[PDB]
Structure 1
Amino acid sequence: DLVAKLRAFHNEAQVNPERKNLKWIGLDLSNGKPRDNKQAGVFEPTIVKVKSLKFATEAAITILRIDDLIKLHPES
């Protein structure tokens, strides 16, 4: 339900140009309710999210590219 409420808030922000201030709505874990995280002082560097996305996508691509494994027995 919390993720559903957050998704509803962000969807309303994206579809309604008059409610663009809802982009900052995040999760308040203390009370379990959506909360404006920009005014709550919950920030992250943009580089963190950008690099996380890029690195995770590349790792997923690398692993997904495999379809066969050959495991040679140790010589000993």
Structure 2
Amino acid sequence: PERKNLKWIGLDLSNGKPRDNKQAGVFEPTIVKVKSLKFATEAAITILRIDDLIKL
């Protein structure tokens, strides 16, 4: 545990080399990702809760 803002390198689009996505990266809204993960989890739970599909 040294820091939380740095040491967060990621992927690059120009070539296959790790680049720090802080000094020149593009930030993304966290609420969008949170809602997407919640919707994916809800869909997975709904699909797993389905048992049979026979006409009962």
Name the TM-score class by shorter chain.
Answer: 0.7 to 0.9
Root mean square deviation of aligned Cα: 2.1
State the TM-score, normalizing by the size of structure 1: 0.59
My pick for the range that moved more, 33-42 or 44-53, is: 33-42
Unaligned stretches of 5+ residues in structure 2: none
CA 1:40–1:20: 2 relative to 1, 3 Å: same
4+ residue runs over 2 A deviation? 19-24
Bigger fraction of residues in strand: 1
TM-score with structure 2 length normalisation? 0.74
The CA distance in 1 between the partners of 2:30 and 2:8, in whole Å, is: 14
Is the deviation greater in 52-61 or in 40-49?
A: 40-49
Higher helix share: 1
Question: Separation in 2 of the partners of 1:58 and 1:47?
Answer: 16
Would you say how many aligned residue pairs link Structure 1 and Structure 2? 56
